[PDB]
């Protein structure tokens, strides 16, 4: 009759219940939301309250309670949950809800070794006083539950043993800003810091995990993925392997080109025993790839590339096929099959495809990427030469075999090597593109290493970022954003550290960036377009011309200010060539949208002053950054309106943006009747993109007689892709609801 319920606090222990405090907090968090029952939430969490429960559990319980009500019909639960979590996380890091003054926080963190000490060296207390005025901690209320789960799980500075969280999202953004523009002239430094801070805190620009979690801390490792090219020599094999080990140790995704390794049977090159062929080395690269992962299999991802005509291609194509002898299988690495025009033509004309070890056909491999004419010449020549070891395969058999394995595993990727060189930012004669990265989006020059510290080797890297098409109002807001994205990444290039000499060489040499989009699907839904009917062709054309034009303008503006990248002379940009001049001709037949920008002015401006960065755009997928912004992933249509994630804290649900008004506007992934629509859109985007796009093919068995996808359909989509200039093809997804 004084039946209380004693709450226990952070070693301050005992104290009576405060169910009216709780309601106030809840009531607050609900402010502005529609369709959320505070009573419902209280009911569901009060029932699990027990006498001496700690306050921290009261928060967890009320948070989950709110999170478990997330649905398509009551989507504001994601914010009610998020805000509760945000509130909890403030108290958790600061003791109050109100964040400490920025200077105080930075000071405290520097003494604790959690932030880089250079922050205080580079900025004055007065400069921190001023940044604090830019900060808006109320923006923490705009995150969705899954986004807070992500920030909390892998972005905010915390102690992973104790569990202690040390910062709040707004300090993250403001300090990312400050670190990246720390070297700017006092005159403009803080105007940039603010502009960027705004951009990222209001989700206009997304930033990769390594950057968001690291910049502001003592680390200098920000690599997402590297591209290494192996020469046909034990020295190079070794070096490649060494490089892979250093890089997976830093969590980077690996793209390996092992296409020049001579085939099994070929002669010992005085000491180098390649009698045994490619597989044994591939296996060796896989162990290297997995050297810093959990059991010897969990974590550490890579994609290995080889030409379709390599002599061991049929053995190579079935490396992930589980039914087979252990010795002839490298199942934990994806493969990238490299194809060009002539291969396809052999398929079309029902003719044969000749396999050759690269060691035996002088000039063929280089020609394959750089000059199709020459490739054809050397190819036909070597087919007739009976001295040359070769094998014949019916092109149909080879293609089907590849598509089959692609179909079953989903991880046998295609790379159109002519497309990558005839429509690229680089001169193929000097710096050709002969491979991609792990998720087939990056396309950059690489040179084999002869030792791990070889200074004449070149490794390409992933320097990324993205525009949120959902958070811009008009495409003319991209000019400001391009500036900020390009400037911040270019600074990162000089800020971060390089574990391997050949990877510094490429970054400093070409200053290559890969900026892409996220929220494409939601963007199309707001404009009432769809993916499969071709209704989004002109809008896509309009949107990617704007993205590429402003990225080049920002990079051009930057070369003016601080000088073009050292190797700008190796780009097609340097010779007055633009993406609008080399795109695949057939696109003209599926989109009439006219360029709205002065490309001719820019052409001269580039020829004259050059480009800071040699490449600027690349469309990567991005589950994590998209989640932070409550955005659909990269350019992909969503699988359904509500996506589900597992956690230790319960089931995390996230509802597609503005489901309330756009449920009928969205075209879910399995609603598309086939792939033509989408591939057309990818081809259009590819007109303007410097690198490549992680494009998927998707098939639903329900749509086919006897539930089996015809090899015909698979080849037809493959050729459709090539016909509209698609550079790469990533995953293949199969099913009808996930």
Partner 1 sequence: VGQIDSEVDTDDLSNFQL
- Scanning 39-47, 83-91, 546-554, 708-716 for contacts with partner 1 by CB under 8 A, the matching segment is 708-716
- Scanning 80-88, 196-204, 290-298, 701-709 for contacts with partner 1 by CB under 8 A, the matching segment is 701-709
| Cβ 257 vs Cβ 285: under 8 Å | no
DSSP class per residue in 625-672: HHHHTT---TTPPPSSSEEEE--SS--EEEEPTTHHHHTTT---GGGS
CB of 301 vs partner 1, minimal distance in Å = 19
User: Distance (Å, rounded) from C-alpha 486 to C-alpha 472?
Assistant: 17
Longest dimension (CA), the chain: 102
CB of 331 vs partner 1, minimal distance in Å = 15
CB of 351 vs partner 1, minimal distance in Å = 10
CB of 344 vs partner 1, minimal distance in Å = 6
What are the distances in angstroms from CA 482 to CA 362, 475, 486, 489? 44, 11, 6, 11
Q: Which two tokens stand for residue 242?
A: 């060494």
Instruction: Choose, by CB under 8 A, the member of 306, 335, 549, 722 that binds partner 1.
Output: 722
Instruction: Choose, by CB under 8 A, the member of 121, 707, 736, 737 that binds partner 1.
Output: 707
Closest Cα to residue 516, out of 475, 461, 465?
465
Instruction: Choose, by CB under 8 A, the member of 37, 404, 582, 624 that binds partner 1.
Output: 404
Instruction: Choose, by CB under 8 A, the member of 101, 292, 407, 642 that binds partner 1.
Output: 407
Q: Is 324 among the residues that bind partner 1 (CB under 8 A)?
A: no
Q: Interaction with partner 1 in 609-628: which residues (CB under 8 A)?
A: 609-610
Sequence-ordered list of residues with C-beta below 8 angstroms from that of 519, at least 6 positions apart, any chain: 468, 469, 470, 471, 626, 629, 631, 632, 657
CB of 397 vs partner 1, minimal distance in Å = 9
How many residues make contact with partner 1 (CB under 8 A)?
A: 42
Instruction: Choose, by CB under 8 A, the member of 341, 389, 390, 603 that binds partner 1.
Output: 341
Q: Is 737 among the residues that bind partner 1 (CB under 8 A)?
A: no
Sequence-ordered list of residues with C-beta below 8 angstroms from that of 402, at least 6 positions apart, any chain: 308, 317, 337, 412
| Cβ 518 vs Cβ 655: under 8 Å | no
B/e letters for 550-567, b = 16+ CB within 10 Å, e = fewer, are bbbbbbbbbbeeeebbeb
- Scanning 105-113, 331-339, 608-616, 656-664 for contacts with partner 1 by CB under 8 A, the matching segment is 608-616
Q: Is 566 among the residues that bind partner 1 (CB under 8 A)?
A: yes
Backbone angles phi, psi at 581, to 5 degrees: -100, -25
Report the residue number, 507 or 517, with the smaller CB distance to partner 1: 507
Q: Is 323 among the residues that bind partner 1 (CB under 8 A)?
A: no
CB of 348 vs partner 1, minimal distance in Å = 5
User: Distance (Å, rounded) from C-alpha 127 to C-alpha 142?
Assistant: 27
User: Distance (Å, rounded) from C-alpha 545 to C-alpha 686?
Assistant: 10
Report the residue number, 424 or 732, with the smaller CB distance to partner 1: 732
Instruction: Choose, by CB under 8 A, the member of 701, 736, 737, 738 that binds partner 1.
Output: 701
What are the distances in angstroms from CA 731 to CA 334, 341, 359, 440, 607? 10, 22, 31, 9, 38
Q: Three-state SS for 405?
A: helix
Report the residue number, 91 or 560, with the smaller CB distance to partner 1: 560
Q: Is 731 among the residues that bind partner 1 (CB under 8 A)?
A: no
Q: Is 396 among the residues that bind partner 1 (CB under 8 A)?
A: yes
Q: Is 368 among the residues that bind partner 1 (CB under 8 A)?
A: no
User: Distance (Å, rounded) from C-alpha 715 to C-alpha 347?
Assistant: 10
Q: Is 552 among the residues that bind partner 1 (CB under 8 A)?
A: no
CB of 716 vs partner 1, minimal distance in Å = 8
Report the residue number, 268 or 738, with the smaller CB distance to partner 1: 738
Instruction: Choose, by CB under 8 A, the member of 408, 450, 582, 624 that binds partner 1.
Output: 408
Q: Is 251 among the residues that bind partner 1 (CB under 8 A)?
A: no
- Scanning 244-252, 285-293, 532-540, 559-567 for contacts with partner 1 by CB under 8 A, the matching segment is 559-567
Report the residue number, 362 or 563, with the smaller CB distance to partner 1: 563
Q: Is 560 among the residues that bind partner 1 (CB under 8 A)?
A: yes
Backbone angles phi, psi at 497, to 5 degrees: -100, 150
Report the residue number, 571 or 629, with the smaller CB distance to partner 1: 571
Q: Regarding beta strands 334-339 and 302-307, do their DSSP bridges make them parallel or antiparallel, or are they unpaired?
A: parallel
**Residue owning tokens 């405090």:** 21
Q: Is 576 among the residues that bind partner 1 (CB under 8 A)?
A: no
Rg (alpha carbons) of the chain, rounded to whole number? 27
CB of 672 vs partner 1, minimal distance in Å = 18
Q: Is 347 among the residues that bind partner 1 (CB under 8 A)?
A: yes
Instruction: Choose, by CB under 8 A, the member of 400, 535, 538, 624 that binds partner 1.
Output: 400
| Cβ 344 vs Cβ 722: under 8 Å | yes
Q: Is 322 among the residues that bind partner 1 (CB under 8 A)?
A: no
Give the CA count within 13 Å in the CB-facing half-sphere of 44: 16
Q: Is 411 among the residues that bind partner 1 (CB under 8 A)?
A: no
| Cβ 35 vs Cβ 74: under 8 Å | yes
Q: Is 709 among the residues that bind partner 1 (CB under 8 A)?
A: yes
Instruction: Choose, by CB under 8 A, the member of 32, 95, 218, 563 that binds partner 1.
Output: 563
Instruction: Choose, by CB under 8 A, the member of 365, 498, 699, 730 that binds partner 1.
Output: 699
CB of 410 vs partner 1, minimal distance in Å = 7
Q: Which two tokens stand for residue 196?
A: 């960027």
| Cβ 221 vs Cβ 497: under 8 Å | yes
Q: Is 188 among the residues that bind partner 1 (CB under 8 A)?
A: no
Other Cβ atoms closer than 10 A to 159: 11
Closest Cα to residue 230, out of 385, 384, 434?
434
Q: Regarding beta strands 352-355 and 460-461, do their DSSP bridges make them parallel or antiparallel, or are they unpaired?
A: unpaired
Q: Is 264 among the residues that bind partner 1 (CB under 8 A)?
A: no
Q: Three-state SS for 303?
A: strand
**Residue owning tokens 């699990």:** 48
Q: Is 602 among the residues that bind partner 1 (CB under 8 A)?
A: no
Q: Which two tokens stand for residue 580?
A: 């609008």
Q: Is 349 among the residues that bind partner 1 (CB under 8 A)?
A: yes
- Scanning 179-187, 213-221, 541-549, 715-723 for contacts with partner 1 by CB under 8 A, the matching segment is 715-723
Q: Is 12 among the residues that bind partner 1 (CB under 8 A)?
A: no
Q: Is 331 among the residues that bind partner 1 (CB under 8 A)?
A: no
Report the residue number, 88 or 406, with the smaller CB distance to partner 1: 406
Q: Regarding beta strands 412-416 and 728-729, do their DSSP bridges make them parallel or antiparallel, or are they unpaired?
A: antiparallel
**Residue owning tokens 């060691």:** 359
Q: Footprint of partner 1 on this chain (CB under 8 A)?
A: 341, 344-345, 347-350, 396, 400, 404, 407-410, 559-560, 563-564, 566, 568, 608-610, 699, 701, 704, 706-712, 714-716, 719, 722-723, 732, 734-735
């Amino acid at each position: 009759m004084n039946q209380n319920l004693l709450v226990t606090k952070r070693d301050g222990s005992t104290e009576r219940i405060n169910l009216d405090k709780i309601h106030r907090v809840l009531d607050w968090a609900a402010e502005g939301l529609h369709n959320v029952s505070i009573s419902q939430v209280e009911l569901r969490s009060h029932i699990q309250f027990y006498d001496g429960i700690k306050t921290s559990d009261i928060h967890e319980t009320i948070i989950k309670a709110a999170a478990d009500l997330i649905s398509r019909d009551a989507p504001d639960y994601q914010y009610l949950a998020a805000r509760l979590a945000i509130f909890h996380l403030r108290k958790k890091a600061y003791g109050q809800f109100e964040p400490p003054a920025l200077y105080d926080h930075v000071v405290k963190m520097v003494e604790m070794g959690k932030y880089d000490n250079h922050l205080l060296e580079d900025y004055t207390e007065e400069e921190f006083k001023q940044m604090d005025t830019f900060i808006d901690h109320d923006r923490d209320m705009t995150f969705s539950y899954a986004a807070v789960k992500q920030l909390e799980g892998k972005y905010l500075v915390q102690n992973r043993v104790t569990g202690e969280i040390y910062e709040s999202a707004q300090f993250l953004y403001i300090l990312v800003a400050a670190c990246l523009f720390s070297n700017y002239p006092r005159e403009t430094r803080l105007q940039y810091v603010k502009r960027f801070y705004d951009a990222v805190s209001t989700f206009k620009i997304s930033l990769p995990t390594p950057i968001m979690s690291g910049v502001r801390t003592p680390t200098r490792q920000f690599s997402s993925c590297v591209l290494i090219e192996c020469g046909d020599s034990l020295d190079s094999i070794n070096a490649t392997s060494s490089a892979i080990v250093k890089y997976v140790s830093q969590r980077a995704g690996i793209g390996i080109n092992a296409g020049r390794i001579r085939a099994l049977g070929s002669p010992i090159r005085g000491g180098e025993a390649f009698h045994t062929g490619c597989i044994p080395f591939y296996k060796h690269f896989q162990t290297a790839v997995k050297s810093c992962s959990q059991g010897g299999v969990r974590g550490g991802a890579a994609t290995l590339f080889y030409p379709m005509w390599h002599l061991e291609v049929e053995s190579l194509l079935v490396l992930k096929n589980n039914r087979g002898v252990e010795g002839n299988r490298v199942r934990h690495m994806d493969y990238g099959v490299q194809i060009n025009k002539l291969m396809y033509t052999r398929l079309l004309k029902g003719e044969d495809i000749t396999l050759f070890s690269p060691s035996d056909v002088p000039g063929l491999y280089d020609a394959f990427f750089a000059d199709q004419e020459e490739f054809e010449r050397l190819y036909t020549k070597y087919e007739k030469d009976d001295s040359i070891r070769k094998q014949r395969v019916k092109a149909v058999e080879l293609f089907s075999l590849m598509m089959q394995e692609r179909a079953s595993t989903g991880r046998i990727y295609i790379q159109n090597v002519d497309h990558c060189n005839t429509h690229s930012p680089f001169d193929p004669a000097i710096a050709p593109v002969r491979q991609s990265n792990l998720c087939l989006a990056i396309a950059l020059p690489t040179k084999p290493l002869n030792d791990v510290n070889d200074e004449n080797g070149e490794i390409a890297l992933c320097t990324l970022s993205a525009f949120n098409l959902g958070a811009i109002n008009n495409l003319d807001e991209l000019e400001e954003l391009a500036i900020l994205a390009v400037r911040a990444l270019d600074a990162l290039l000089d800020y971060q550290d390089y574990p391997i000499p050949a990877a510094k060489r490429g970054a400093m040499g070409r200053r290559t960036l890969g900026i892409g989009v996220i929220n494409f699907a939601y963007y199309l839904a707001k404009h009432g377009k769809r993916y499969s009917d071709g209704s989004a062709n002109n809008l896509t054309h309009k949107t990617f011309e704007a993205i590429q034009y402003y990225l080049l303008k920002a990079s051009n503006e930057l070369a003016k200010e601080q000088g073009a990248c050292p190797w700008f002379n190796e780009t097609t940009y340097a010779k007055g060539i633009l993406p609008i001049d080399t795109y695949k001709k057939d696109l003209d037949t599926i989109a009439n949208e006219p360029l709205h920008y002065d490309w001719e002015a820019l052409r001269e401006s580039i020829k004259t002053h050059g480009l800071r960065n040699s490449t600027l755009s690349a469309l990567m997928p991005s589950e994590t950054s998209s989640q932070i912004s409550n955005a659909t992933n990269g350019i992909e249509p969503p699988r359904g309106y509500v996506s589900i994630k597992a956690s230790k804290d319960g089931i995390l649900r996230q509802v597609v943006p503005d489901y309330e008004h756009l449920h009928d506007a969205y075209e879910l992934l399995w609603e598309m009747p086939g792939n033509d629509g989408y591939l057309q859109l990818v081809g259009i985007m590819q007109k303007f993109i410097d690198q490549s796009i992680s494009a998927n093919t998707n098939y639903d068995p329900s749509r086919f007689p006897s539930g089996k996808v015809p090899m015909q359909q698979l080849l037809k989509d493959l050729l459709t892709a090539y016909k509209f200039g698609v550079k790469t093809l990533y995953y293949q997804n199969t099913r009808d609801g996930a």
